[PDB]
Design a protein around this ligand. Sequence first.
Ligand SMILES: Cc1cc2nc3c(=O)[nH]c(=O)nc-3n(C[C@H](O)[C@H](O)[C@H](O)COP(=O)(O)OP(=O)(O)OC[C@H]3O[C@@H](n4cnc5c(N)ncnc54)[C@H](O)[C@@H]3O)c2cc1C
Ligand SMILES: Cc1cc2nc3c(=O)[nH]c(=O)nc-3n(C[C@H](O)[C@H](O)[C@H](O)COP(=O)(O)OP(=O)(O)OC[C@H]3O[C@@H](n4cnc5c(N)ncnc54)[C@H](O)[C@@H]3O)c2cc1C
Ligand SMILES: Cc1cc2nc3c(=O)[nH]c(=O)nc-3n(C[C@H](O)[C@H](O)[C@H](O)COP(=O)(O)OP(=O)(O)OC[C@H]3O[C@@H](n4cnc5c(N)ncnc54)[C@H](O)[C@@H]3O)c2cc1C
Ligand SMILES: Cc1cc2nc3c(=O)[nH]c(=O)nc-3n(C[C@H](O)[C@H](O)[C@H](O)COP(=O)(O)OP(=O)(O)OC[C@H]3O[C@@H](n4cnc5c(N)ncnc54)[C@H](O)[C@@H]3O)c2cc1C
Ligand code: NA
Ligand code: NA
Ligand code: NA
Ligand code: NA
Lengths: 326, 326, 325, 324
Amino acid sequence: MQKETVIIIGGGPCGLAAAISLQKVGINPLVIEKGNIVNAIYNYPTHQTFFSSSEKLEIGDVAFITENRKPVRNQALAYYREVVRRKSVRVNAFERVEKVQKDGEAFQVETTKRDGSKEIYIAKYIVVATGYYDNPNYMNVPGEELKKVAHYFKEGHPYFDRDVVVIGGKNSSVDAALELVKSGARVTVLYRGIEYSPSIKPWILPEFEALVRNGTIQMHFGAHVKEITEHTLTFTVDGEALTIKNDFVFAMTGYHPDHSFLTKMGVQIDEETGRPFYTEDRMETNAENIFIAGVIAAGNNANEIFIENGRFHGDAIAQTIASREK
Amino acid sequence: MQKETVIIIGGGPCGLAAAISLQKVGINPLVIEKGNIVNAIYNYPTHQTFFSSSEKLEIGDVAFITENRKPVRNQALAYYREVVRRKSVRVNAFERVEKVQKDGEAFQVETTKRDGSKEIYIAKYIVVATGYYDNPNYMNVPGEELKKVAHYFKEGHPYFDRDVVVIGGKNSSVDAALELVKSGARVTVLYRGIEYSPSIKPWILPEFEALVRNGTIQMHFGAHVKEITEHTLTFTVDGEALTIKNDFVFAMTGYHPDHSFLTKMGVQIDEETGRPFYTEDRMETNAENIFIAGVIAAGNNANEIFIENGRFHGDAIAQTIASREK
Amino acid sequence: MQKETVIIIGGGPCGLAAAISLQKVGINPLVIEKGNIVNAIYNYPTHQTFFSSSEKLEIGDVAFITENRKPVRNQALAYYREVVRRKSVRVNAFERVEKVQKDGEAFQVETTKRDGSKEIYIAKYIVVATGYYDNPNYMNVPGEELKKVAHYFKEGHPYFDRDVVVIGGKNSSVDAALELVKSGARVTVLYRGIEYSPSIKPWILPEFEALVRNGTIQMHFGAHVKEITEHTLTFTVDGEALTIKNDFVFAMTGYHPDHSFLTKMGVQIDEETGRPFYTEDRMETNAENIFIAGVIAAGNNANEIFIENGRFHGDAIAQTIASRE
Amino acid sequence: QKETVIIIGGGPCGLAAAISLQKVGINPLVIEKGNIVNAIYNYPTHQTFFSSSEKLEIGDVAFITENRKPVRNQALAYYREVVRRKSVRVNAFERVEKVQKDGEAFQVETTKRDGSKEIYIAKYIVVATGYYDNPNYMNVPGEELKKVAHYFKEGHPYFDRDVVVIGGKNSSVDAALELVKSGARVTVLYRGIEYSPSIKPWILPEFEALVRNGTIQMHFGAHVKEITEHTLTFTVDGEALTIKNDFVFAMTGYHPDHSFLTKMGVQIDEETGRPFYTEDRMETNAENIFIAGVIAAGNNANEIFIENGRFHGDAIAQTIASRE
Ligand SMILES: Cc1cc2nc3c(=O)[nH]c(=O)nc-3n(C[C@H](O)[C@H](O)[C@H](O)COP(=O)(O)OP(=O)(O)OC[C@H]3O[C@@H](n4cnc5c(N)ncnc54)[C@H](O)[C@@H]3O)c2cc1C
Ligand SMILES: Cc1cc2nc3c(=O)[nH]c(=O)nc-3n(C[C@H](O)[C@H](O)[C@H](O)COP(=O)(O)OP(=O)(O)OC[C@H]3O[C@@H](n4cnc5c(N)ncnc54)[C@H](O)[C@@H]3O)c2cc1C
Ligand SMILES: Cc1cc2nc3c(=O)[nH]c(=O)nc-3n(C[C@H](O)[C@H](O)[C@H](O)COP(=O)(O)OP(=O)(O)OC[C@H]3O[C@@H](n4cnc5c(N)ncnc54)[C@H](O)[C@@H]3O)c2cc1C
Ligand SMILES: Cc1cc2nc3c(=O)[nH]c(=O)nc-3n(C[C@H](O)[C@H](O)[C@H](O)COP(=O)(O)OP(=O)(O)OC[C@H]3O[C@@H](n4cnc5c(N)ncnc54)[C@H](O)[C@@H]3O)c2cc1C
Ligand code: NA
Ligand code: NA
Ligand code: NA
Ligand code: NA
C-alpha cells in the first residue's frame, strides 16, 4: 500500500493551509478530499458574500486582493485554486476517507475512490481537517425527508411566487430569507429563539428587521416545527400549533462535526464543552500523532473557529511533526 | 375539468411573450411550466453572458435596463420575474404537461403536478412553447450513461486539476472549454467537423484559437468518440483510434425539440430538418388550433430562432386566436 | 423667441418626473438643463451605491429592475437615459437658465448655451427643479480655496498613502472615509456634531464605527476647522487647537439651493434654512405660476426630500397647471 | 538627495522595475507626477483589460480574478496592494523636470505638489514615462475648443448628442461603442482606407456590426479639416463634407516625450519614434540611462504592453547589480 509521511483528511481552507505549513518545513503531505478543493465554499449559495475581508482568508502568503471590501464565493474559489496551483499542494480529489486505524507506529487509512474502488495508505501522522458542513442538524420531524425540504441554500430564483419557510435564526437563515424576498417568494421565518439572534451581522440586521416589522417577512419567534407535508407546515409557539400553507422549506438549522469519525480513531471528546481533546500549541489530539485543523476543533459553539483563525492550526502541526522528523 | 381559452406549454421567454401578446387581445391565458419561469435560463452556466443586447430580450414593453452592454444570466432571471409580476401573467409552475388530445372542438391537456397528482384541463387553443434545452443530442456511445458524462455545463470549479473532454463544436462547447481552462482543468476538445463552425460567435473564437495555438487546449478535428470508461476515452480520427486518460466528459453536442411530444399531438415534422409544419403568419401548425412559439419552431442545427425573433411569435398567434374568438 | 407652455429648469430625476407628469395631462414641456440629464448623479462618486431600492427611483412607470438589492450610479445613469428616450422628454441640454422675469401673464426666460450665445423663451409656467448639488456649503476658513480642498468626492485611488481629512457627518462623509480607507489613505474625520447623524445608513455605520474603535480612522466629534495649509490642517475641539499633517481635504459639508436664482425671479426664501415658500398641495411658490420640484423644496439641509418622494411633486404641479390650462 | 537609481514614472512597468531592483539589493526611488498607476487611473471608467490578470502581475504578487479579464478598478486595487506589500518607495505628486549628467552621476530636477523644487543626484536613471500623457495632436483649426477631447472617460453626458470619434485605434473603437451604448449619435472618421489591423479581433465584430446596420456612420480615408462649435468638416476623396457636431473625441493615439529623452542624451532615430537601446540591458545610447515599459516602443506602439514591459526591470536590475 502507498506510504505517506502525513495524510491530511479534507481539502478545505484549513487543510490546505496545513499542507503548505508542512511544505515550509520540508514535508510534502497528501491531502485526501472527497470532492474537489474547498468543497464547502463550492457548496455556498451561488452569490454568497463572505463576512471576512479577503486578507483574512489568505493562506500560504498568497495575496487575495479584491476591489470590493468583502469577497464573494466565486472570488474565493478562484483564489484557492490559484493557491493550490502555485504551491503544488498534493490533492487526491474525489476520494473519501472511510477509516483510520493504528498499525504499529503508523496508521492505515482506507478510502473509496470516485469509481467505487477501495484504496489503503500507510501514514506516520494524520491531520483531520474535515469541517462540519457535511452534517446538518436534522430536526427529526415528519416530512423533513420530502424533496421540498433542504438543509442548504443555493439560489432564490426558482422560488418565485412560492410559499417558502426558512427555519433558523442565524446568518444563514437571514441571508436565505433576504435572497428569497428579492426573488419574489413569500417568506416565513421560524426560529426557536425568542428574539433576534445576537449573531446576525450588524450590517444585515437592519434590512431584515425592517422587513419583519412591516410584515413582509412573516416571523415566528419561539417556534418549534412539528410537521411538514407537501402543501403545509405545522409549528408550535408556547405549545399552541399553527398550520400554514407551504411549498418549500429551507431548514437552516446549522451543522455539527462528525465526532464518531474522531472517536473511532482514538480521539476523545470533552463533554460539556463539545471539543475534541487537544493541546493548542501542537494542535495534537489525545491520540498520539493524530492532529486536527480547522472547525473540526470547535466545541458546542460551532462559530468559535472559522477561516481567519483556523488557517493557523497547521503552523503548530508542522512545527511538531518537523521536530519529530519522519 | 378546469376550462381555459388558451393554454401555453412552457414559460420560457417566448411562451411568456405569447401570454402577454394574448393579453393585448383580451385573453389572459394559462402558462403551464414544469419548473419555474425561464427554467432554461436558470439552468444556463453560472457565468453565462448573453450574446444579445438587453433590449432584444425585452417582452411586454417592460424595460430591461443594463449598464453593461450585454446582460448576464442573473440579470435576465431578475428581468423575467419582474415581467411576470408586472404583467400579471398566469403561471402554473412545477407542473409538467404530459398529453394533449383533441376531444371535440377543444383539447384535453393532462398534467402532473409537483406532488405527483394529475390534473386535466380543457382548452380551446394550444401554444407549444417548449424549446429544446431539455433534450440533448445523445452521442450513442458506450459509456455515455456514466455519471462522469454530462450533456450540460454549469460551473468549472470542481474540475480543477482534472482531465476533461468537451465534445462538440457549438458555441456551448467552446464556452465550456474556456471556462474549464479558467478553472484549471486539463481540457481536450473533440469535434467531428474539420474546421471551426462558422456559428461560433466571432468575438469568442479568438480566445479559443489562441489556447489551441499555444498548446493549452488539445484540439482534435474529425474526431469521433467510440467509448467512454471511468478513466479513459477512445476516439478515432481518419479511422485511427486513440485512447486518452479522462476523468469527466462534457458532451456539448447541442439539443433538439421534443418531436415525440409534437407528433403525439398531431403535428407533422420534416424528417431532414427537424422543423414542424406551420404557417408563419399564424404560427399555427398543421393541427388546427395548435400553435408554436419560440425556438421549438426551428429546424436543422438551429441558429435561426432565438429570443430576439422568437419573442414575436405570440403576436401572430394572438391575432389569429382573436379573429376566431370575436 | 421660443414659446412654451411650461419650462422646467433642471433635468435631474425630479425635473424629469415633472415633465412626464405634465405629459400625462397633455402638455409636453421643455426641460432646460445646464449639463446633460441627471448631471447630479453623473457627478456622484464613481462607485456610489444608492440607499433606495431601484423601484423607488422609477419614474414614468419605466421599470428599473436590478439583480442586486440597491442600484449603483452607473445603473441609474442608464435608467434615466432610457426613461428620457422612451418617454420622448424634450431636453435642451448644455443650456444654463440665467434669469426668469415676469412679462405680462407669462415669463421671459434667458439662458446661456454651450457656445456662449444667449437665448430667450416665453413660458406660461415655470418649474424650478435645480436641486442643490451645485452649491456647496462653504466653510469660509483660510486655505479652503487651495486646490488640495474639494467639496465633492469622486474616487479614492489617488489618495493612496496620503494623509486625508474628511469634514462632515452625513452619509457622504462616511462613504468617502470608507472608500479612502479601502484605497490606502490615512483618514481623519472631523465633524462639528457630537454624535453620529441619524441619517447615516444603518447598514454602513457599523463598519465605520468598527474602524474608529480599532484606530484605523481618527474621528473627532465637536471639531471646528480653523485653518488649512498645503501640508497641515488646524482644528479645535472644546476650544483646544490641534494641528495635524494633511495632504488633501474633502469638505463634505453638504449643499444648498441657488438662492440668488430664486429670489431674483420673485420667490421668497427663508434666510436661515434656505427653503422656498410654497403650498404643498400645488407645489407653487409665493410667486404665481412658479412651481418647484425636487430637493430644492427642502433647503440648506434637505434630507426630508429625496427621489423617493420628490418624484411625485410633478403630479401636484401637473394637476394645477392642467386645470389652469 | 542621493539615491543609486531613480525611476521616472510609477506605472506598472516602473513599479516592476523597482521590485526587480529590490531583488538585487537596491531599494530605488520612484518619482511619479500623480499617484501610482496614474495612467490606469485615467483609463475610461468602463475599461476592461485585453490581458488576463496573470499577465499583469508584478513582483510575484498574485492577481486573482473570478472573471477572465480584469477591469480598471481591479488593477488599481492590485497595484496599490503591490506597492504596500513590497514597500516600494514612491515620491508621489512630483514631476521630474530635467535629467542632466553631473560627473559620473545625474542631476534630476523636480517640481512638487506645492510648487517647490527639488534636486536629487542618482547614479542610474530608468525612464518609464509611457506615452499616455502626450496625445497625437491633429493640428487642425478648432482642436483647441473645449468640445474636443483627446481622452475618453465616460459616455453618459453625450446622451442624445452628435459626437465624432477620430482615429483607428482600439481606443477609438472602444469610445465609439461606449458612446453608442450611452445614446450618442456617433460618426467615426479614420484616415485609413479600411478597418485598422490593430483592432482586437474580439472587438472589431461588434463595431463592424453597428456600421453595417447603420447605427455608426463610418468614413474611411477621412481627413478632418475644421471643427466649429456646431459643425465639423472633413474631406473624403476630394469632396469636403460638413456635418452637425456637438463633441469630438480625437482618439489618435499617443507618443513618448521625445524632448525629455533627447535633452538627457537619448537618441530617437527619425522615422520610428523608438529610443535607441540594447534589449539585453534595456540601456539607451546614453550610459546608465535605461528605459522600461511602453516608452521603448516605436511607430508600432502596440509592440510593448504590460505583459512584456513588466520584465524590462529584470534586464535593468541585472545590469545595475553587475556595475555595483
Ligand atoms: C455561507 C457561509 C459563509 C461563510 N463566510 C465565512 C467568512 O466570511 N469567513 C470565515 O472565516 N468563514 C466563513 N464561513 C465558514 C467557513 O466556511 C468555514 O470556517 C471553513 O469552511 C472551515 O474550513 P475547514 O478547512 O476547517 O473545513 P471545510 O472547509 O468544511 O473543509 C472540510 C473538507 O473536508 C472534506 N471531507 C469531509 N469528510 C471527508 C472524508 N471522510 N474524506 C475526505 N474528505 C472529507 C469536505 O469535503 C471539505 O472540503 C462561512 C460559511 C458559510 C456556510
Ligand atoms: C448558454 C446559452 C446562452 C444563450 N444566449 C442567448 C442570447 O444571448 N440571446 C438569445 O436570444 N438566446 C440565447 N440563448 C438561447 C435561448 O436560451 C433560447 O433562444 C430561448 O430559451 C428560447 O426560448 P423559448 O421560450 O422558446 O424556450 P425555453 O427558454 O427553452 O423555454 C421552454 C420551457 O418549456 C418548459 N417545458 C418543456 N417541456 C414542458 C412540458 N412538458 N410541460 C411544461 N413545461 C415544459 C421548460 O421547462 C422551459 O422553461 C442562449 C442559450 C444558451 C444555452
Ligand atoms: C452620493 C449620493 C447618494 C444618494 N443616494 C440617494 C438614494 O439612494 N436615494 C435617493 O432618493 N436619493 C439619493 N441621493 C439624493 C439624490 O441625488 C437627490 O435626491 C436627487 O438628485 C434630487 O433630484 P432633483 O431633480 O431635485 O435635483 P438634481 O438631481 O440635483 O437635479 C438638478 C438639476 O438642475 C440642473 N441645474 C441647476 N441649475 C441650473 C440652471 N441654472 N439651468 C439649468 N439647469 C440647472 C443641474 O445641472 C441638475 O442636473 C443621493 C445623493 C448623493 C450625493
Ligand atoms: C484603455 C486602455 C486599455 C489597455 N489595456 C491593456 C491590457 O489589457 N493589457 C496591457 O498589457 N496593456 C493595456 N493597455 C496599455 C497599458 O496602459 C500600458 O501598456 C501600460 O500603462 C504601460 O505601463 P508603463 O509603466 O510602461 O507606462 P504608464 O502606465 O503610462 O506609466 C507612465 C507613468 O509615468 C508618469 N510620468 C510621466 N511623465 C512623468 C514625469 N515627467 N515625472 C514623473 N512621472 C511622470 C505618468 O504619470 C505615468 O503614471 C491599455 C491602455 C489603455 C489606454
Ligand atoms: Na430554529
Ligand atoms: Na462532435
Ligand atoms: Na462638520
Ligand atoms: Na484618423
